[PDB]
Amino acid sequence: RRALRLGVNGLPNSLEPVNAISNVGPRIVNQIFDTLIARDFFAKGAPGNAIDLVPALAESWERIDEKSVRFKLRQKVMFHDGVELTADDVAYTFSSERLWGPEAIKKIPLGKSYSLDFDEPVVEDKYTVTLRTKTPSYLIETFVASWMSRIVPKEYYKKLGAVDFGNKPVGTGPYKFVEFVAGDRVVLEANDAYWGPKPTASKITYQIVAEPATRVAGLISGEYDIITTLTPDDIQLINSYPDLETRGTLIENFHMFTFNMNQEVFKDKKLRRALALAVNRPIMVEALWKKQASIPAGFNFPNYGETFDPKRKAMEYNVEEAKRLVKESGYDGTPITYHTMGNYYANAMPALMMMIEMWKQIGVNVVMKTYAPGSFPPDNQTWMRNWSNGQWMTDAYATIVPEFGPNGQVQKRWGWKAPAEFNELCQKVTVLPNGKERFDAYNRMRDIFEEEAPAVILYQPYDVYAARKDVHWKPVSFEMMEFRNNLSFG
Template identity: 45%
Template structure:
């Protein structure tokens, strides 16, 4: 079992001194500290195109690499959007439909196999990721634009799209784009019955041990092209109870903890050797409504539920005013694709009561389902929202479940969810999360069969297949208007994500759930 970093801090000075001498790398590798991270939950697999979740990407970001990397440190606050080389050394637009990728030479997967263009082509292939019947069901949401990935030579590929795609480079730097080893993936897929649980990547850390619901241990990949990792091992230990994670940070059992609530920040900062580090996420906590449920099939009822939520009060009560209530399902980071004048969310309980009356709502029961630990503050938010809904005349019952595993999510009237902005554009936000390949439309079928969703899908197809700014703006702004009017759900707020961190761990959080432990973002020299 790897020792906590705190148990190794006394030898850091010795390690630094030795580094100035003639000590060989293998000896240094033995004396690097072990990092222990206390997390609320762990992913059930480490297949990077399947575990597109906050708990999954947190771990997978260190195991796998993308062709292009988004440099989150390029802007203050961990939200930079500059694109820099990853497994690709360069990328060039050959024409409106073709992006040429040049691969980095000498890169090896964790099993020792060299990275090849064939591995990349397989990663994005129709059978694995980009086709309508892909083994990874969420893949088409990100790469249905692909027509073909053509291998030109061992280090050159052409990504050919079905129409001009203004976001292809951003797609290759984002979710679902982590590159896997073809031979390993296929062998493990056959062994695991369809999808491999633990494919290999090229990242700075590789899987050493996996114990479901307990821990994931990663060991350093000293041959990493981005430099030798600064931790010998990284252990993600599952600790669902927030107070237990804080106690572990205080005692030195953990070096970093996740999902710190705002009311724990002052406590953590009161100690000399630990501190809270926070970012507002490029992610919104949302509610999902079933438009096909007989109680909720009138859009006016769903609109009423949205109007009855005082999001500013939720922000103050649960987040100390440090979360952000966005202007609908859109965000300023979209730049020219953002419309500041749109009224995205409103609090109007009187209008909510009027809409319920107009819809003929007669006190039918609505169940609000949430998990207590998956999303920070999800349960207290649900408890408050339930009372807000009761105030406008809704007969609502809170249904708390430990996990949605085995639950027919499509049958739930109201449930908690979150939407991450995969890339700084509406395609990476409302379209990815609510379009035809999304959970609400494809997997769970909670938003289907309305005139609004049909028009939304028409506009989304335009949005992702043209580079003309005016055309894209018109399509995107109508889409967010439809989403608000059809009300298949609602945005609550962008949460404050806070980590507790030992002060001698130099590490910066990002506006995504990625936990970047590469050498440029993790060191132990002290602050």
């Protein structure tokens, strides 16, 4: 088998699966680990965007009541160190100690904020485990299929601790850990003992190539098999080569800019709103995305299924109202910084250059500040910054509630003083089943989010990959790379 060489935009700081959550971690951790329920993106010949849930580490499951789901595990599944997967490992993955409890907070900083209102899992027998919540939750199934739910081995993880585990991970996945050179490369090798479809690559190397031009030059020279995070502008050059091609898809993620609301200038919504009202999204989509990025009608996406509103009004664009707001805020012309980690996000710097011009036209002076990979500056050094959110559930709960909710980092770390009504709705949507009330509640939260502008949604990006024609691999509609029944060499 051939060794797969990937040229990537970045690498996670840890391979601990929850701590690896980002645009760059899942493409690695999806290989090392498995979940209880997996998504089949290619079901019924779909082009990598199917919503179908299939058994994975759990052979079967059934909801018991409004607060609990019982899982029957696949038997004789082995972790990379030869240890058999049991209900103890699953119970540990979803425990108070490891994930969501007070003791987990130092190990996994966003563990509590990103998890459901869990109670301790109940081990029924060697291959049976019940996962439960303290309050009603109709989200257990989607959460279990998510990137929060990769199964870790109890004994090994406990012996290493979360930090050491992140540097030497052990999972049940099709590929096992070889090496991790901080901010340089991650090397994995085939786990030939895998319970599912056998790995088709002998080795997988994720090599950081921060500059997108250097990444393209690497692919042309034959240094890489697949490269990530390109823009639709790179398409024509790569496809002119008979041995190379581009492979792209709209992903279930949105690019945005956000604010440090602990800063005096952003404590009040006025200037946040003015900056939001001046963003001409259709012009950015034409100029940078060749019409391929999608502009959502609010914090609202098709993957939400029952909580997606196809009838919602477009996010407002109003230059005159933006000008009136800049004057009202008493803004004095002082430059406001906007932090970006180069082009970690496709089109980050070109989008910022366009926005700086749009903002200069409303009387706001914004200046770009770059930071190095894995070198995010202290919070007090930041005003504006770009970010993204992967829409990780088949429900509107993520990411409005885990990121922007009363327990989330936007309010707790970044100082958004959310209206009491918003926080009250977050709590209501957490516990309600789908229906008219829950659907209407998300639309009200969406309206408040637009009035408050704690972040400004830009678009759903069109993820662009480039690969050697002889490397058969299809992108999926999520910020990850799937190789199960989706990797072969010509």
